[model samples]
Target: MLEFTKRSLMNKYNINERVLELYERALNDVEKEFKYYDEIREYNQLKVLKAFQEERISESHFTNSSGYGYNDIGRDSLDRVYANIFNTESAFVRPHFVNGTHAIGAALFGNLRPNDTMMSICGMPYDTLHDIIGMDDSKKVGSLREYGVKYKMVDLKDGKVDINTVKEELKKDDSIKLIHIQRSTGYGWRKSLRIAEIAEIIKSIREVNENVIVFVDNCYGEFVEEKEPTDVGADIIAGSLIKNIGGGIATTGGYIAGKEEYVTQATFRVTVPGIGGECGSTFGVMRSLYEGLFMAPHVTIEAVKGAVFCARIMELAGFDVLPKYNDKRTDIIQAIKFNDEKKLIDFIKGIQTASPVDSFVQCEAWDKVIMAAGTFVQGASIELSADAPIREPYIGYLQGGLTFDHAKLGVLIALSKLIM
Candidate 1:
């Protein structure tokens, strides 16, 4: 839990006793969840330990391995537990890519063969893929389609993905080689699709067509739930480090973990298409990747606590919030909906001034409505600021991790803005 004691504040920024109490409660709640998650985690750790014991004997004879290439120095061992927990045969785990979309693109482009047709099993993927996949002026047939792959899309904009419809599409089209699961609508604060939820879709589709590969864009969803789709039999899993797995400490990099056959091909495509194995930039980033895994459990809890705080505190302040504190969370994120444009702007600025994202100087963006600019790793132009996607109501999105105490400060800041 969080250790709280009355400490001196430079001005008058001391957090209240009730606020401190809420922080502790959040921490306690997370501890309980961790206890359950860890029971399974510890049992899996033994398998990793046994694997390490075997590695030691092999290392004694062969000592040429000097650099930290992909899965080097037990890096794959750490990820293997997750893979085994998810029941995936092979995985391409890395923390070298820059962000989540980049990771997703790398996997999709790598998996699609020269003429293997690609379709968004869920729908036209979020806002940015158009440019990335070589559809728009961003770069005509950039890389993925320039070679020969044809693209197909399923329109799911009305609401969440309908599994039966998606399955039917899979049965109808043999050309559909990959199923791209993009969750949360690209807005981080909302509860995105959990691994178990997506796992059901994969299970149904694969029940008929075992060869079809399912790739889940797991950027904001990592570490929130104790497992990945790979745990439930997905082919590939990709995500952004700056969101969950990196634990807010990783200033750079992303990850892609999936079945070995496909992952090896994806990794090969990342470097040089002809190169068969990974041999670059892994040593420098491996330490961060390893440490990120250790911190992820705790950091994920903090992020969820923040989500809970934002939800409850907003409801207390008389505004609508999604993923109510009591709701089963699919991810460690919360959406505070004010509906009104001006009020949403005020709420956003309140949280931004105190955000840990930017500490040196206050960052603000001016457009039609005023909002504080949030610099997240994934570049979303119409994101949680003054200028954002035209959704139902103007929404303010926030995400980060340190401790529930900091999360409360952000929540309190939002509430305080309402009254003041």
Candidate 2:
């Protein structure tokens, strides 16, 4: 028998019977999905072990070092490990990436020249990437646009990529050097692109121009599915360690994996031309990085289950949700439409209240939006994060839960506040 009262969480939150009933029903309904995610996780774990075996990860890889960061064996082995996991010819894993945007910027700036043009096939990218692509007019953010690289995009038609539009754009622009495909939806309401869908897009792009490079911003999409973008013909795939790839253990870092030449170019952009791919000491973080990769598959499965439960919870509360409860998940993010700014704020605050890290304090909505995150690493969404942009028909994006039980608690807490 399931005893709801046996846990401290039930008493601490004073969870009502209705919330408990809904949660139990969701758990029962999601058993099949849970099994599928578990299998995927196991497969990914096998891949990680294979990489570890091939790289011959050793105790010496965990030692600390400083200065010029030249000839770092741990760093070199880590790069090989990442490359093996991604099935890529080469990879660049470094602590200097700082964030996802920085890692992506390196991949772009390293490859793109002043006369070359970059095209986005998945509509616009996330907000922070705008400055990196030089799309934003706010201030001189020193992005690809500042260097005179041109940009274009094909908006999705009815939630699907406009492949015809992409073909036309590619044909029209002879200077188009890179085709950027964002695997995750980012802030968009459209469903995240599946691997098959991405593969089809890649095929079409290649048919149009075989020489054009294809780069994928793989943030928030790693380990969610059985295959990654690199496996589907992407020339370059970039993501942050603080997100899915890190398993919430790595303090800070990012990774770029793909073809050898492209990875080398990104490495050059991350470091310098002459010292490319040779420096950047792991500085005792190699153990964390390796263990984190090993743990990512399980952590990602937990988050995916949490997202499925969140969708069901939101649907029960009379709110609109994307990718309804049993929908195929390509990523961990769950989007709920609150339709009112106050409701959004209330929901986010409720999530903050449920946080284990900073429960005693209140969270304010920044610039008409709120982010509920109390992670050890700042901005590490993989720990547990919920944020809502202050836009029309108010919508809130909730992602990550270290465990399914923790996610259930967050949903119950948020729903309680909403009803009150």
Q: How many clashes does the backbone of model 2 have?
A: 0
| Candidate 2 lDDT | 0.85
Candidate 1, position 345, lDDT? 63
Please estimate how well model 1 matches the true structure, expressed as its whole-model Cα lDDT: 0.61
User: Could you tell me the lDDT of residue 87 within candidate 2?
Assistant: 88
Per-prediction TM-score to the true structure, in the order listed: 0.78, 0.96
| Worst 10-residue lDDT window, candidate 1 | 378-387
Give the C-alpha miss distance for residue 194 in model 1, angstroms. 2.3
Residue 187 error for model 2, in Å? 1.8
Residue-level lDDT tens digits of model 1 in 292-406: 5556666666666677666766666567877776775666657777787656666666666555555334434442434454545333211222223434577766665466666
